[PDB]
Write an enzyme that holds these catalytic residues in place. Sequence first.
Site, PDB file in Angstrom:
ATOM      1  N   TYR A  51      -6.239  -3.794  11.171  1.00  0.00           N
ATOM      2  CA  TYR A  51      -7.560  -3.953  11.725  1.00  0.00           C
ATOM      3  C   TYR A  51      -7.611  -4.701  13.049  1.00  0.00           C
ATOM      4  O   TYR A  51      -8.661  -5.205  13.462  1.00  0.00           O
ATOM      5  CB  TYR A  51      -8.505  -4.517  10.661  1.00  0.00           C
ATOM      6  CG  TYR A  51      -8.256  -3.920   9.318  1.00  0.00           C
ATOM      7  CD1 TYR A  51      -8.257  -2.536   9.130  1.00  0.00           C
ATOM      8  CD2 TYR A  51      -8.051  -4.721   8.190  1.00  0.00           C
ATOM      9  CE1 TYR A  51      -7.930  -2.000   7.888  1.00  0.00           C
ATOM     10  CE2 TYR A  51      -7.777  -4.204   6.937  1.00  0.00           C
ATOM     11  CZ  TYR A  51      -7.746  -2.821   6.790  1.00  0.00           C
ATOM     12  OH  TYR A  51      -7.466  -2.346   5.564  1.00  0.00           O
ATOM     13  N   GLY A  96       0.783  -1.260   0.000  1.00  0.00           N
ATOM     14  CA  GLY A  96       0.000   0.000   0.000  1.00  0.00           C
ATOM     15  C   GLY A  96       0.792   1.275   0.000  1.00  0.00           C
ATOM     16  O   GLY A  96       0.209   2.341  -0.102  1.00  0.00           O
ATOM     17  N   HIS A 139      -4.172   5.732  13.835  1.00  0.00           N
ATOM     18  CA  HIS A 139      -3.038   6.615  14.000  1.00  0.00           C
ATOM     19  C   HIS A 139      -2.301   6.718  12.661  1.00  0.00           C
ATOM     20  O   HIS A 139      -2.585   6.014  11.708  1.00  0.00           O
ATOM     21  CB  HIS A 139      -2.124   6.161  15.139  1.00  0.00           C
ATOM     22  CG  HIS A 139      -1.520   4.812  14.940  1.00  0.00           C
ATOM     23  ND1 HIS A 139      -0.423   4.577  14.132  1.00  0.00           N
ATOM     24  CD2 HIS A 139      -1.838   3.620  15.485  1.00  0.00           C
ATOM     25  CE1 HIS A 139      -0.139   3.287  14.138  1.00  0.00           C
ATOM     26  NE2 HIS A 139      -0.960   2.691  14.975  1.00  0.00           N
ATOM     27  N   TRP A 140      -1.382   7.680  12.574  1.00  0.00           N
ATOM     28  CA  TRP A 140      -0.790   8.005  11.277  1.00  0.00           C
ATOM     29  C   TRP A 140       0.203   6.990  10.729  1.00  0.00           C
ATOM     30  O   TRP A 140       0.681   7.085   9.575  1.00  0.00           O
ATOM     31  CB  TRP A 140      -0.194   9.384  11.255  1.00  0.00           C
ATOM     32  CG  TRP A 140       0.921   9.699  12.194  1.00  0.00           C
ATOM     33  CD1 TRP A 140       1.321   9.028  13.305  1.00  0.00           C
ATOM     34  CD2 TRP A 140       1.744  10.874  12.103  1.00  0.00           C
ATOM     35  NE1 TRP A 140       2.370   9.730  13.920  1.00  0.00           N
ATOM     36  CE2 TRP A 140       2.599  10.881  13.208  1.00  0.00           C
ATOM     37  CE3 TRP A 140       1.800  11.929  11.199  1.00  0.00           C
ATOM     38  CZ2 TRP A 140       3.583  11.870  13.381  1.00  0.00           C
ATOM     39  CZ3 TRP A 140       2.718  12.952  11.393  1.00  0.00           C
ATOM     40  CH2 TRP A 140       3.600  12.917  12.479  1.00  0.00           C
ATOM     41  N   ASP A 177      -8.209   2.442  15.608  1.00  0.00           N
ATOM     42  CA  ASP A 177      -6.752   2.639  15.850  1.00  0.00           C
ATOM     43  C   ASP A 177      -6.099   3.320  14.692  1.00  0.00           C
ATOM     44  O   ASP A 177      -5.038   2.915  14.219  1.00  0.00           O
ATOM     45  CB  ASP A 177      -6.061   1.324  16.183  1.00  0.00           C
ATOM     46  CG  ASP A 177      -4.679   1.536  16.850  1.00  0.00           C
ATOM     47  OD1 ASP A 177      -4.416   2.638  17.378  1.00  0.00           O
ATOM     48  OD2 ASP A 177      -3.874   0.595  16.764  1.00  0.00           O
TER      49      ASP A 177
HETATM   50  C1  LIG Z   1       3.761  -0.088   6.338  1.00  0.00           C
HETATM   51  C2  LIG Z   1       4.104  -0.711   7.673  1.00  0.00           C
HETATM   52  C3  LIG Z   1       3.343  -0.055   8.808  1.00  0.00           C
HETATM   53  C4  LIG Z   1       3.966   1.271   9.218  1.00  0.00           C
HETATM   54  O1  LIG Z   1       3.231   1.940  10.242  1.00  0.00           O
HETATM   55  N1  LIG Z   1       3.102  -0.865   9.993  1.00  0.00           N
HETATM   56  C5  LIG Z   1       2.207  -1.868  10.171  1.00  0.00           C
HETATM   57  C6  LIG Z   1       1.886  -2.319  11.463  1.00  0.00           C
HETATM   58  C7  LIG Z   1       0.765  -3.069  11.621  1.00  0.00           C
HETATM   59  C8  LIG Z   1       0.077  -3.522  10.466  1.00  0.00           C
HETATM   60  N2  LIG Z   1      -0.944  -4.362  10.320  1.00  0.00           N
HETATM   61  C9  LIG Z   1      -1.114  -4.481   8.973  1.00  0.00           C
HETATM   62  C10 LIG Z   1      -0.213  -3.717   8.267  1.00  0.00           C
HETATM   63  C11 LIG Z   1      -0.073  -3.615   6.801  1.00  0.00           C
HETATM   64  C12 LIG Z   1      -1.067  -4.239   6.021  1.00  0.00           C
HETATM   65  C13 LIG Z   1      -1.047  -4.164   4.644  1.00  0.00           C
HETATM   66  C14 LIG Z   1      -0.008  -3.492   4.028  1.00  0.00           C
HETATM   67  N3  LIG Z   1       0.244  -3.220   2.725  1.00  0.00           N
HETATM   68  N4  LIG Z   1       1.378  -2.482   2.573  1.00  0.00           N
HETATM   69  C15 LIG Z   1       1.846  -2.278   3.788  1.00  0.00           C
HETATM   70  C16 LIG Z   1       1.018  -2.883   4.769  1.00  0.00           C
HETATM   71  C17 LIG Z   1       0.971  -2.946   6.169  1.00  0.00           C
HETATM   72  N5  LIG Z   1       0.562  -3.091   9.252  1.00  0.00           N
HETATM   73  N6  LIG Z   1       1.615  -2.241   9.050  1.00  0.00           N
END
Ligand SMILES: CC[C@H](CO)Nc1ccc2ncc(-c3ccc4n[nH]cc4c3)n2n1
Length: 328
Positions: free
Chosen positions: A218, A138, A181-182, A179
């Site tokens: 989520y 993403g 947050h940025w 949740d």
């Molecule tokens: C980009 C990393 C991020 C930085 O704050 N930290 C987390 C932490 C928890 C979390 N849960 C799902 C995803 C998740 C889910 C789908 C994704 N597609 N591309 C990146 C993804 C990340 N995350 N990511």
Amino acid sequence: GPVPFSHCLPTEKLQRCEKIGEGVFGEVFQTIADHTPVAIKIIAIEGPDLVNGSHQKTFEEILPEIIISKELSLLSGEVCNRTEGFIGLNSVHCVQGSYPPLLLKAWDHYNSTKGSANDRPDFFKDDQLFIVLEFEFGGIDLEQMRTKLSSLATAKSILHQLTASLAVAEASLRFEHRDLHWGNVLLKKTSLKKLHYTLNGKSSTIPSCGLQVSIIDYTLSRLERDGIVVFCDVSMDEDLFTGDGDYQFDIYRLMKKENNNRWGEYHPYSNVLWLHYLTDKMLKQMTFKTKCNTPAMKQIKRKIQEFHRTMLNFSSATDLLCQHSLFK
Ligand SMILES: CC[C@H](CO)Nc1ccc2ncc(-c3ccc4n[nH]cc4c3)n2n1
Ligand code: NA
């Protein structure tokens, strides 16, 4: 039953893994699957060792996040309530094994450069179970992009995208993110000038400013279908509500105030609270490449400030999207 880690992460896929994020739940890596970028979330389950300060969830306790990830992923392909503003879910596996040394290498690199709040995941035995969620990639999180956005027009776009996506999920799923947050707002470059959503059958567009937003993670989210509610019951969590030093931590307490600590209920005002926290970050903690020194850009700033001031009087993301002057 479970498959070995090498089922999900063959050697070449493991060799390309780079760690991108983390939480108490475990670890998130970026890698390449069939010439395509993906994100891998790895969560230890069913074991008795403490992991990042909590006990591990059972398979049953991870199902809510799986269900929610799937429902929000499907919204990209729906018709009456359609949004690409969440993230695609490609697969879910239960794997068994000790943590791959190549993932430990990636974990170490992240700890050396960004610092980790987690335990190094090197203590898991060869019978350990994990859930591995593979998502569409993403982009980069809003926090990491805080000095990289072009202008407040870009900020308006991001707020509009977020509001619309949340509205569509409210409409279809009685969704609360809980949740946002940025770190949970991802940005990716797009050459599309306008992005499309459909809310209760009415389609609209949003100027992209060259970016597409994806809302992720989520873990704490809630939704329902046909009267059946899926959520994370945090009514007995202490620590979630005693954070300090960022408005983020106030949002947890304000949600608890809103819902009387009953997390199964639907309170879409939580989505408003997160949008307010995000608007606050936009006005206070971002450095734009272009300052707001033209009348046009000034006008956008005034509009975002007006949003900040008034949005907490709205009942949901849907109310904001449909009624707030920022989007008219
Ligand atoms: C980009 C990393 C991020 C930085 O704050 N930290 C987390 C932490 C928890 C979390 N849960 C799902 C995803 C998740 C889910 C789908 C994704 N597609 N591309 C990146 C993804 C990340 N995350 N990511
Ligand atoms: Na998306």
